[PDB]
């Protein structure tokens, strides 16, 4: 329950089993459903597209992100005016997803009332919009619901800022520190105005409080020691905003943080939500744009629309192909069959739909695509005409290429997206259940012993146990570290992932003595 | 035992098949009141014919996604209704009589019902059913409205349903083939693959029919249940005990008689 267990490739060039103590709070925060969902998403992504060379780097990054998430959750967990502010922000953070679902319900309730609007020239000749319902309570209900929806949108923004922004800032700072130390981006290379992220990150380097969310507070000293001899100690000190003379015994940071926040896509979406809610008080019918939130709210809707978005580039490109083909048909029509495009019953006033090239193209794109049999359903009958056979071929080819083939292509793209997503899911699951995540040894070897693979994955090579050991190392003092702990802590500090057992394990090393 | 009878009857009335048969009888009784109530017994073909049950399994495999995308269609049509009721109300006059106009979008709920009714069922969308926008100030806006309605609702939102049905067909086929492949490539009891047993000709067939037959295991289980505990022999009493404490460690897993005595047998 609390006894941890991992295996590492120790300094003795042999697999060594390490025992550590896990805490109940960390176990609960790891068993939390949101952390479980994040774990599932990470596993799916890495198994699907993450390569084997960078797999464990991605795993360690995910472990660090999870550790920071559980730290934030522990901070916000609830056991003068500053106490009120801290308590209120913690309440919004713990109930952020409840408020987001609450806002969705208020969007449906408002839009249901909006179905009772009526328009009339006379007041209840600029027209008048009013609610037509006999009960007499739905207008005050709509007013109260609109005010409540705006309030809930504001609370959702505040809760997001309190809850999810710290993780984004932490990830940005971690990536920047890694680039400074192990890459020398600004020290040696520097971006070329193509990396707007790097250009914006230039600001925070000189700030005294560059590492705030990231744990490593010694990053500036480490990069200074690593790059001083090569790039000038004085130059490095100037770039990093620190003075050497102080060691003989933040508006800029706020600007950079707010730039990252306003670049964040989820924050931009919530800001758009709030803006549209505010426009709702100007025109209640602007609350209909909050029904689009169902796609981002419902996981079922998100998965269903993933079929459309999987091949969206091909869908728009084949729409362009359809436009080109219809333009070619328009060229042929405007050059040869102009007489058949008279859409006027009145004989005195003809309405020629193909006497202008753009008019004919618009007519085609409008009616021919939406017609069941093509443009021949909408244009004049060619019976008993000189160009009867040519026009028949024209209509038949239009129907076959545009109505049949060019829409079967779209439907097949959607169906292929469905099938490909299903196959990706099944492939990820099969690989996960047939091969060990850490060492990569197949279940065939471990299955010689009954329940051998299950025991090995739950106990010997548990990725949860590896994350727990990582955070145990991070929490524990460097001086208090024991031998193996300091060894693996060092290889974590230089980002060397050779301590993870790959291709072998305790059983594969000591099978002769164990059995 | 009145309490036992009450509990038994509660379980019976909770049983789904018993509830279905009770509904069948109730509708048959209502048939004598109105013979046309006997039409509800034609729905029994789905539960009777295995072919029909398998065919309707394609619809029911993704039924949650089908109803959820129907709700998505409703939301999208509601958005189109909002846009129509706000901007293109003049095009929704469905009256040939000039003296009496029949405005289908002068009321919001009427316009939504009109959309849900005719626009979805129309071949080209709502533009097939509403007034022609030629020679109008909002001609291009209304053309974009109709084209987007046709593409999103008629094309994409029905291709989604058809693709869901087809994917259900394919997934059921793949599940069947996967189950069959696993069953014929691995032993049910011990889990050892057929590659080991196939060294001997017909080795896997002999092993599955004779050594590790699940039918034989069931027969032994019922033989133990029938036989007296006193009459049980040594191994029989041993396995009977581990059955009594629900311990399934007596089933051979990962090894068998051949894997144990291959050196002496061959
Ligand atoms: N190294 C691993 N650690 C944890 N689970 C693993 C590992 N390798 C495979 N799995 C699979 O992941 C699931 C539990 O996380 C199980 O299906 C298990 O077989
Ligand atoms: N342990 C088993 N007992 C019976 N049939 C098995 C077993 N393992 C696999 N099978 C397969 O089941 C079918 C017969 O029940 C055959 O295809 C056979 O190969
Ligand atoms: Zn392993
Ligand atoms: Zn067997």
Curated annotation (Swiss-Prot), chain B:
It is found in: Sarcoplasmic reticulum membrane. Residues 50-64, 170-266 are cytoplasmic. The modification Phosphoserine is found at residue 95. The chain holds residues 4772 to 5037 of 5037 of the full protein. Changing residue 126 to T: Loss of channel activation by halothane and caffeine due to Ca(2+) store depletion, probably due to constant Ca(2+) leakage through the mutant channel. Residues 109-128 dip into the membrane without crossing it. Binding of [3H]ryanodine indicates that the heterozygous channel is activated by Ca(2+) concentrations 4-fold lower than normal. Single-cell analysis of cotransfected cells shows a significantly increased resting cytoplasmic Ca(2+) level and a significantly reduced luminal Ca(2+) level. The chain crosses the membrane at residues 9-31, 33-49, 65-85, 149-169. The calcium release channel activity resides in the C-terminal region while the remaining part of the protein constitutes the 'foot' structure spanning the junctional gap between the sarcoplasmic reticulum (SR) and the T-tubule. Pore opening is mediated via the cytoplasmic calcium-binding domains that mediate a small rotation of the channel-forming transmembrane regions that then leads to channel opening. This is Ryanodine receptor 1. A motif (Selectivity filter) lies at residues 123-129. Residues 32, 86-108, 129-148 are lumenal. The modification Phosphotyrosine is found at residue 92. Detected in skeletal muscle (at protein level). Fast- or slow-twitch skeletal muscle. Homotetramer. Can also form heterotetramers with RYR2. Identified in a complex composed of RYR1, PDE4D, PKA, FKBP1A and protein phosphatase 1 (PP1). Repeated very high-level exercise decreases interaction with PDE4D and protein phosphatase 1 (PP1). Interacts with CALM; CALM with bound calcium inhibits the RYR1 channel activity. Interacts with S100A1. Interacts with FKBP1A; this stabilizes the closed conformation of the channel. Interacts with CACNA1S; interaction with CACNA1S is important for activation of the RYR1 channel. Interacts with CACNB1. Coiled coil: none annotated. ATP binds at residues 183-188, 208-214. Ca(2+) binds at residue 230. Cytosolic calcium-activated calcium channel that mediates the release of Ca(2+) from the sarcoplasmic reticulum into the cytosol and thereby plays a key role in triggering muscle contraction following depolarization of T-tubules. Repeated very high-level exercise increases the open probability of the channel and leads to Ca(2+) leaking into the cytoplasm. Can also mediate the release of Ca(2+) from intracellular stores in neurons, and may thereby promote prolonged Ca(2+) signaling in the brain. Required for normal embryonic development of muscle fibers and skeletal muscle. The N-terminus is blocked. Disulfide bonds: none annotated.
